[PDB]
């Protein structure tokens, strides 16, 4: 089974590696899915492309943009 994650851009490679391990462990431990069956997809959303309460994340000082630059 298949875990799709969306989150504001700005996480490091190590945080992404950690999240993939931890989400996989969570599926295996909780419902006994075979480890080899677990897929995880992480998609970084630029802060210009993610809306919260009608506002972009960049307008709220959160996240980085498509080249990793903070607001």
């Amino acid at each position: 089974s298949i875990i799709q994650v969306t989150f504001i851009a700005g996480r490091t490679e190590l945080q992404k590696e950690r999240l993939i391990a931890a989400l996989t462990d969570a599926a295996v431990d909780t419902v006994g899915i075979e480890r080899a069956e677990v897929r995880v997809i992480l998609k970084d959303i630029p802060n210009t492309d993610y809306g919260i309460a009608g506002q972009t994340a960049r307008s709220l000082g959160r996240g980085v943009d498509r080249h990793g630059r903070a607001p």
Binding site: S1, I2, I3, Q4, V5, T6, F7, R11, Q15, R18, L19, A21, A22, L23, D25, A26, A27, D29, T30, V31
Partner: protein
């Protein structure tokens, strides 16, 4: 963070509850997101609608 997990039909409501809890806590721990910002939902796929290697899970199980 938004987490959508596609699961094949067959898990109990209590397994689904534990899954959304364990997926949430895994995110909190792994990337330090505050728990109330994490959204986790499950999308249940009938076995006739989940393909592995070109074969449906229903056909595999049969």
């Amino acid at each position: 963070p938004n987490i959508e997990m596609f699961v094949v039909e067959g898990y109990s409501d209590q397994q689904k509850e534990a899954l959304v809890g364990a997926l949430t806590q895994a995110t909190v721990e792994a990337i330090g997101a505050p728990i109330d910002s994490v959204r986790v939902w499950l999308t249940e796929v009938p076995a006739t609608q989940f393909g592995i290697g070109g074969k449906t899970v229903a056909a595999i199980a049969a």
